[PDB]
Amino acid sequence: LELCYRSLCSCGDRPIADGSLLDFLRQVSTFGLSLVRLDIRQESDRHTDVLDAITTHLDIGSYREWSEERRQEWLLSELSGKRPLFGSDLPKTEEIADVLDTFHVIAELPADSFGAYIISMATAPSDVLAVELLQRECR
Amino acid sequence: LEKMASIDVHLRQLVPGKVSEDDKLVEYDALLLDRFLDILQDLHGEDLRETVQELYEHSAEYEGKHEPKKLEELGSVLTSLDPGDSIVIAKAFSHMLNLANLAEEVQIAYRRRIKKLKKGDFVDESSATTESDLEETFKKLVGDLNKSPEEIFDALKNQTVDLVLTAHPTQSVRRSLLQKHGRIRDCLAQLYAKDITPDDKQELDEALQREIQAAFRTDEIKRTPPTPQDEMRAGMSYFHETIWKGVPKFLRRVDTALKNIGIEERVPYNAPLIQFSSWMGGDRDGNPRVTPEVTRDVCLLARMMAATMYFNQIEDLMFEMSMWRCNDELRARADEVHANSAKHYIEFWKSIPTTEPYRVILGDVRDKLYHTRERAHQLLSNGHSDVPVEATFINLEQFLEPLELCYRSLCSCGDRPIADGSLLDFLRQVSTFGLSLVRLDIRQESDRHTDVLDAITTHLDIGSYREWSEERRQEWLLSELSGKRPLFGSDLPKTEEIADVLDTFHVIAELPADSFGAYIISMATAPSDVLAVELLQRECRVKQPLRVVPLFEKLADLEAAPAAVARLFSVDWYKNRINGKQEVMIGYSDSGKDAGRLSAAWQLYKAQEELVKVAKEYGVKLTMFHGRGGTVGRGGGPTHLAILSQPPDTINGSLRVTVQGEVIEQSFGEEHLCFRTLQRFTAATLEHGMRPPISPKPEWRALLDEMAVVATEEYRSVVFQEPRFVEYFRLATPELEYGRMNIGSRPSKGGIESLRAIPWIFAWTQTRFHLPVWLGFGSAIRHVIEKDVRNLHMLQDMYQHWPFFRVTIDLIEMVFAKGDPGIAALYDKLLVSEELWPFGEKLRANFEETKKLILQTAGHKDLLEGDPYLKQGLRLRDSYITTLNVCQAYTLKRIRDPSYHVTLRPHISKGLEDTLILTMKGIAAGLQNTG
Numbered sequence A: 001l002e003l004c005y006r007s008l009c010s011c012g013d014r015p016i017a018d019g020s021l022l023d024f025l026r027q028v029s030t031f032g033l034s035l036v037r038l039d040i041r042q043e044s045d046r047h048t049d050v051l052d053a054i055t056t057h058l059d060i061g062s063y064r065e066w067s068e069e070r071r072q073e074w075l076l077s078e079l080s081g082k083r084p085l086f087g088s089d090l091p092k093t094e095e096i097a098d099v100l101d102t103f104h105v106i107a108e109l110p111a112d113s114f115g116a117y118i119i120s121m122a123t124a125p126s127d128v129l130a131v132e133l134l135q136r137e138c139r
Numbered sequence B: 001l002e003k004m005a006s007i008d009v010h011l012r013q014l015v016p017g018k019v020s021e022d023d024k025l026v027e028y029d030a031l032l033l034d035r036f037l038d039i040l041q042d043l044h045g046e047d048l049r050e051t052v053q054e055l056y057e058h059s060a061e062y063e064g065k066h067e068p069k070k071l072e073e074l075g076s077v078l079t080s081l082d083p084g085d086s087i088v089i090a091k092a093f094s095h096m097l098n099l100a101n102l103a104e105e106v107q108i109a110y111r112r113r114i115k116k117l118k119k120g121d122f123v124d125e126s127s128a129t130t131e132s133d134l135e136e137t138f139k140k141l142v143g144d145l146n147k148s149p150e151e152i153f154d155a156l157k158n159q160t161v162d163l164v165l166t167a168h169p170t171q172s173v174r175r176s177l178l179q180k181h182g183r184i185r186d187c188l189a190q191l192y193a194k195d196i197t198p199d200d201k202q203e204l205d206e207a208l209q210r211e212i213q214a215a216f217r218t219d220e221i222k223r224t225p226p227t228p229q230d231e232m233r234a235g236m237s238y239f240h241e242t243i244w245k246g247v248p249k250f251l252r253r254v255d256t257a258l259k260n261i262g263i264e265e266r267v268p269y270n271a272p273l274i275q276f277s278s279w280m281g282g283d284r285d286g287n288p289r290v291t292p293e294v295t296r297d298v299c300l301l302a303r304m305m306a307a308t309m310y311f312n313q314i315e316d317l318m319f320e321m322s323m324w325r326c327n328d329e330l331r332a333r334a335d336e337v338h339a340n341s342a343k344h345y346i347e348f349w350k351s352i353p354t355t356e357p358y359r360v361i362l363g364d365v366r367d368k369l370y371h372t373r374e375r376a377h378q379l380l381s382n383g384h385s386d387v388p389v390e391a392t393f394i395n396l397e398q399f400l401e402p403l404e405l406c407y408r409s410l411c412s413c414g415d416r417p418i419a420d421g422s423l424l425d426f427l428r429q430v431s432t433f434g435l436s437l438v439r440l441d442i443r444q445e446s447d448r449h450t451d452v453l454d455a456i457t458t459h460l461d462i463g464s465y466r467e468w469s470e471e472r473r474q475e476w477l478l479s480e481l482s483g484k485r486p487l488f489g490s491d492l493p494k495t496e497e498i499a500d501v502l503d504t505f506h507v508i509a510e511l512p513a514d515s516f517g518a519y520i521i522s523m524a525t526a527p528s529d530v531l532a533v534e535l536l537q538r539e540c541r542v543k544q545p546l547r548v549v550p551l552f553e554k555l556a557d558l559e560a561a562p563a564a565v566a567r568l569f570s571v572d573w574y575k576n577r578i579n580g581k582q583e584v585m586i587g588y589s590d591s592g593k594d595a596g597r598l599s600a601a602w603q604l605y606k607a608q609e610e611l612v613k614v615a616k617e618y619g620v621k622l623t624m625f626h627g628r629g630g631t632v633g634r635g636g637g638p639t640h641l642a643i644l645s646q647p648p649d650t651i652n653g654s655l656r657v658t659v660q661g662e663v664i665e666q667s668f669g670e671e672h673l674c675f676r677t678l679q680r681f682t683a684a685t686l687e688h689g690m691r692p693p694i695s696p697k698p699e700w701r702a703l704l705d706e707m708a709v710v711a712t713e714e715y716r717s718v719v720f721q722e723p724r725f726v727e728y729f730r731l732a733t734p735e736l737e738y739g740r741m742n743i744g745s746r747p748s749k750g751g752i753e754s755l756r757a758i759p760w761i762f763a764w765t766q767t768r769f770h771l772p773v774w775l776g777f778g779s780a781i782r783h784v785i786e787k788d789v790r791n792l793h794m795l796q797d798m799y800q801h802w803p804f805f806r807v808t809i810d811l812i813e814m815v816f817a818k819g820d821p822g823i824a825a826l827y828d829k830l831l832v833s834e835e836l837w838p839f840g841e842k843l844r845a846n847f848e849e850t851k852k853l854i855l856q857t858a859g860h861k862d863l864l865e866g867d868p869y870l871k872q873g874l875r876l877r878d879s880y881i882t883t884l885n886v887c888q889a890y891t892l893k894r895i896r897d898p899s900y901h902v903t904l905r906p907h908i909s910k911g912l913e914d915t916l917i918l919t920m921k922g923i924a925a926g927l928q929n930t931g
């Protein structure tokens, strides 16, 4: 479409280019391939449950009992590390499987479809870092 | 055309006596050779035929008296041929040798056995004419060991013979040429039926000529050094040839022999007495052509071949299963299946009615087999299908369930005889072959797994797994296999090789477990090597991991092997993962390349003794996998004694042996040969489980321990210490040209240590010298005879009463029959520097001395004094091989030395590389197995 616009302007047909073609270009820019970008929203506590099942499964403690500073320290060591966090061998409750499956579906779809991951009941930096880490470890 | 009178005379001089009175071998080869030479005259002229026949007569005279003038007479002709004539003569002698092989197989297959020739001891088990058949083994166990028939039957039920098909080290003969050889053997056999009519005989003669010409008129060089998929296709030919029909026929004969000792049951149809495994497409050790895709391909190809054979066989089964009386259970299944959509039997029936319930069930099985075949084909040629996995057989139980329902139902109604026919054959074929025909082993160097783990630990900033001691390696591996966190992801710097290893594991995870057998670790030395594979398997998400099998190659590795296996069994995780079973592999050729053959032999007997001790300690059922080069890898009768010779309790109802590619045609090419192969493996396994060889006298153990030291000294002093040995090896032998040519893969991946065992054996087998097989025996026997006058008598006692020693020496004697120091001297004269001539001269003297000493040990004046049939056939082949030897030698001189100008001869009627390849393939096909 931009090739058509440039070409039309080259030949003094800019008025022709500023018609249906301009409307089309502006519609492609405004709406993209999706019309809308979908936000995902979830409670912070649900991410806390996922990380708690993980740390319990690794015999390191309960991410839930940890203070905010200890939560931050562990999350920071994991986002900066080179080893993956969990696999199929992980006791998942129905809710925890919902959270992880949502991330997997996000990974299997085009980035043009998504906007922001919104954390309901956010209170501390560990809430945001949990989502960044879960995103990274769900590929 | 009285030329026929000359070749007959020469043939009769080559094979003078009669090894029986059905000895038609000279007749067979005379007929085939006459017909071939006529075809050769018609296609390439009268002069070409006369030249070729003069050469063969000189070669046979040489194999008679070994006059060196005959070799100079061969060479004078062979150097004067321009490359065209060189190609035609080389091709001609290759096919002449093939015909001698075919005549030999027919003679073996139709030779009547002699009951009165049995001596009554174990020596009889070293030849097909005197070995014990299935029922004679039964009665030997009942009379001499007083075992009850029920114990024999119970031993058979739980016994498994596992035959492993590996790629041929050279020309893996194409399926089409196997079939032509079959037609030639069939025409030969039928031409000597003592009742045949004149017109039948005339048409058989014409068919034989037609087929010999057909084989001579196909090229066998161009295109590609066949892709591993092609080599696998050619290797699978023996299932269609003989094995598919052969397995149920053999098992039924087991039933009859059980009836002749009072057992009324049959061997249960699901009992895996016979199994087949494959390395074709799975062995990656020093073979970069074997990729993850190659493995995926041969797995799916095998599922296709099997589904095809079941599909074609179940139509005859459907015609036979025309009964109506049935079980209540089967009648229920018939009513269920009739409620559905009959596309693969419109030529047979518009539709199958419910008054033929067995046909209803079997027709649905035929439908599922068709969907399995077409689905695997779609996966192979694309990567996806559209065939629902629920419309096919994914595991062996889905397949067996309706067939077993038919069997039970038939027995319910007193139709057991009907059930014991085509249906029993089918059940036994499903149990033996499964959904794949073969199970594919994967093999890889331990170092490659070490590289993968080293890149991992370096990526995690924990150190280099490579620098770690064996104990630290074990400690880390143990913490990871017991842990709950995965090890690595896509964010991992992978080299090309490391990606090959990991991708192989991923392909294994994406395919059915029925397709795989064992993961074999080449150059295994320590428990960390095995634990690395178990961990890499688990972290690559292989749900049903393969069993890990260490291959202990070098001599020191064998000595440390029972310690390493004990440490493995002592780890709780590995103990509960293996579920009471462990398979260990030994490589006769591999260990011999390290420390000579005699030392490797005695060391392998001891290593198996100690491994059995460990397995009994920890309550594990041990399975010894015999790689290539062994006594149990020979062709024919000798294998029977070799299996009986193994140390006590090393088999225990579970035999796994490599079927070497240079022997697979001799063993499975023909109907009778196939039956007898299966029979001797089964009988020897059964007998060894109940009747171990005698335990060695203490002085025998001490003597062999001494001889092993002297033999390793001589072998290593020549192969590894002599500085100019490698220089000689590159001159007196086509080792360089073998790797550079086109055959196999890589021979290096330095010196001989990095050289693989197969090129090591091959290079010296081509020159009829066989140094890797016999070197070391000479000095060992000289040493012990000189140390004590009486040791000769002790050696002579061992050869007469200790099976292990007799088979070891016997193999050496057979290799000496295929050896000729005069030809090796010709290679020296043409290809080796003058200042290296005494070196080869010394080696040849060693050759001679060992020969006499081996003879003295075996109590023989001539080679193979106790097996004249084999001596006879070997002499027959050697007469053709010798011409290919001289031709190969002068061709090598022509390639390496363009300053060697020859007085050419005019071309003889309608590229030196092609000549060389012809001679290699031919000589390899005529010498077959050595070490």
Ligand SMILES: [Cl-]
Pocket: B229, B297
């Ligand atoms: Cl293919």
Ligand SMILES: [Cl-]
Pocket: B350
């Ligand atoms: Cl019809």
